[PDB]
Amino acid sequence: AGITGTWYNQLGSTFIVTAGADGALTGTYESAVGNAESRYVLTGRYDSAPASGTALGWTVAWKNNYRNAHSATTWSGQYVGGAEARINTQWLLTSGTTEANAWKSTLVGHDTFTKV
Amino acid sequence: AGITGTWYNQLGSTFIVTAGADGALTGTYESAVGNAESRYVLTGRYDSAPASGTALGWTVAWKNNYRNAHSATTWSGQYVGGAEARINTQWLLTSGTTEANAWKSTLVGHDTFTKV
Amino acid sequence: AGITGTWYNQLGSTFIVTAGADGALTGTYESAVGNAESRYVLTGRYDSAPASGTALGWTVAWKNNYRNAHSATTWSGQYVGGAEARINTQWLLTSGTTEANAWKSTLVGHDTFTKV
Amino acid sequence: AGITGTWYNQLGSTFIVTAGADGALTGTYESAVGNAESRYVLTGRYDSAPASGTALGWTVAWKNNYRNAHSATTWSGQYVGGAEARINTQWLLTSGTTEANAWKSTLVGHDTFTKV
Numbered sequence: 031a032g033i034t035g036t037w038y039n040q041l042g043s044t045f046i047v048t049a050g051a052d053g054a055l056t057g058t059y060e061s062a063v064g065n066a067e068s069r070y071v072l073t074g075r076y077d078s079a080p081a082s083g084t085a086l087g088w089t090v091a092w093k094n095n096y097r098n099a100h101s102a103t104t105w106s107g108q109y110v111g112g113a114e115a116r117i118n119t120q121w122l123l124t125s126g127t128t129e130a131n132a133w134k135s136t137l138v139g140h141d142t143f144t145k146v
Numbered sequence: 147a148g149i150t151g152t153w154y155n156q157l158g159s160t161f162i163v164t165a166g167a168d169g170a171l172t173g174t175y176e177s178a179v180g181n182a183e184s185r186y187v188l189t190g191r192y193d194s195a196p197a198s199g200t201a202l203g204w205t206v207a208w209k210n211n212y213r214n215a216h217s218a219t220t221w222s223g224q225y226v227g228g229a230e231a232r233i234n235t236q237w238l239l240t241s242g243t244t245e246a247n248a249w250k251s252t253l254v255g256h257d258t259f260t261k262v
Numbered sequence: 263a264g265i266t267g268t269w270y271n272q273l274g275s276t277f278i279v280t281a282g283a284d285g286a287l288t289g290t291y292e293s294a295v296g297n298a299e300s301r302y303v304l305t306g307r308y309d310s311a312p313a314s315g316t317a318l319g320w321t322v323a324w325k326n327n328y329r330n331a332h333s334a335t336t337w338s339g340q341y342v343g344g345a346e347a348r349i350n351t352q353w354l355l356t357s358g359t360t361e362a363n364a365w366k367s368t369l370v371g372h373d374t375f376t377k378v
Numbered sequence: 379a380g381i382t383g384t385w386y387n388q389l390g391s392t393f394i395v396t397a398g399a400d401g402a403l404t405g406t407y408e409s410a411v412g413n414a415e416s417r418y419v420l421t422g423r424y425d426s427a428p429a430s431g432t433a434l435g436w437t438v439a440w441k442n443n444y445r446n447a448h449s450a451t452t453w454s455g456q457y458v459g460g461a462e463a464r465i466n467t468q469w470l471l472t473s474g475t476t477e478a479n480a481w482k483s484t485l486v487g488h489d490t491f492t493k494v
């Protein structure tokens with residue numbers, strides 16, 4: 031119940047997710063930034079029997095029927111319930127590159143999601 | 147085909163994956179470290195229409211029928227095919243923590259997977 | 263002028279720094295968290311001819327005359343001037359470990375400093 | 379003695395360092411990549427009274443008499459002595475950016491330094 035719903039980050043992106051009783055996360059991501067357009071499929075996992083926040087993570091490959099950025103982001107973080115539910119994360123964005131450029135293929139950042 | 151198979155990291159963990167035509171990664175991860183015991187389920191996404199490496203990412207929540215570490219790792223990287231295929235990644239491992247310990251909830255590292 | 267001064271982060275730590283005309287950063291760090299006590303020496307570098315924010319970085323090894331945590335943190339970020347001067351960073355904290363534990367030796371986080 | 383010397387990473391960059399008795403690292407870094415040309419100054423800190431590896435870290439701002447990339451890298455890691463000594467690190471490279479691009483200002487990677 032907690033995790034399932036609609037969430038937004040500080041860039042204005044939208045994450046719609048359903049938490050399955052088996053630990054699965056499925057939904058769609060709508061990005062406000064990058065070489066973006068329309069929604070993208072996401073998939074992840076979460077601790078379905080937490081103790082503390084609830085550990086979780088998900089991935090988006092930035093390819094849909096309309097655009098392909100040849101890149102993927104993974105967000106790793108924890109869900110914190112309360113009056114104000116939040117998902118605090120750190121993320122890694124890797125771009126497909128040639129061997130010579132691989133050393134500079136990965137960005138790191140942090141995003142905070144607020145539930146709506 | 148390329149990504150689909152059994153891979154091993156430097157620690158000796160085993161990543162069994164199936165890459166779907168549509169961009170899904172599904173499979174099992176058997177760890178050689180941490181508060182482990184048995185296999186865990188993973189899910190991810192990948193660029194199913196690459197341009198040089200193939201961007202991808204996946205998540206494992208460290209909970210199975212035997213134990214629960216109340217944490218999850220996300221791996222973000224690229225698959226590089228050829229005679230000696232490899233998946234080069236960076237990872238983030240987040241633990242569920244109290245708010246007071248949240249500043250130190252996330253470890254970062256790098257893993258190289260090969261078929262040997 | 264800009265960077266030189268006293269700054270605090272969201273954990274309540276204090277950073278006192280002087281920016282030299284040659285790109286050097288020198289000062290002391292006073293930590294609110296960890297296996298801490300008293301102040302620690304810092305040293306870093308910054309872009310002394312920026313374009314955009316000003317790139318910079320610094321290190322603290324958590325050893326003084328009173329305690330030794332056998333660890334060091336590096337903060338990498340940029341200084342942004344204005345009414346409200348800020349230093350936005352991401353950091354890595356590495357602990358000295360045995361070979362068997364090296365894979366889990368490094369934490370990653372983010373800190374925002376406000377000038378006083 | 380141990381840390382003091384000339385080291386090389388996987389890219390072929392050269393790190394010339396002097397470790398002070400008190401915990402200071404000082405030296406020069408000559409890059410084999412990026413918007414480079416010549417040597418750059420570095421400064422860092424290290425644990426001068428280790429317990430297994432020796433925690434350390436350093437910064438380079440990418441500005442010299444010839445060019446300025448308006449960025450800086452920080453390396454955080456540990457020195458492991460012996461017959462075949464190594465410095466294993468993770469790094470963060472931050473570029474000075476406008477606020478609109480700040481979300482993607484930081485690259486993350488890993489470097490291994492050896493004496494060969």
Ligand SMILES: Cc1cc(/N=N/c2ccccc2C(=O)O)ccc1O
Nearest residue numbers: 043061062063064065066067092099
């Ligand atoms: C659409 C698109 C988005 C993109 N990075 N997105 C993100 C990355 C990290 C954190 C948040 C976002 C975010 O969108 O909220 C990169 C290429 C691209 O084509």
Ligand SMILES: Cc1cc(/N=N/c2ccccc2C(=O)O)ccc1O
Nearest residue numbers: 159177178179180181182208215219
């Ligand atoms: C079994 C178990 C494993 C664990 N970290 N593993 C990893 C973390 C990062 C990269 C690789 C692994 C790897 O296993 O290959 C953390 C909790 C836990 O219960």
Ligand SMILES: Cc1cc(/N=N/c2ccccc2C(=O)O)ccc1O
Nearest residue numbers: 275293294295296297298299324331
């Ligand atoms: C005193 C002490 C501090 C410590 N982490 N500090 C930090 C690490 C990352 C970001 C901010 C801090 C901060 O202090 O603002 C780790 C061991 C230790 O003995």
Ligand SMILES: Cc1cc(/N=N/c2ccccc2C(=O)O)ccc1O
Nearest residue numbers: 391409410411412413414440447451
């Ligand atoms: C000369 C130059 C280099 C640069 N990144 N270098 C690096 C970054 C991370 C790790 C190693 C290096 C390395 O050189 O070993 C970025 C701007 C620039 O002008």
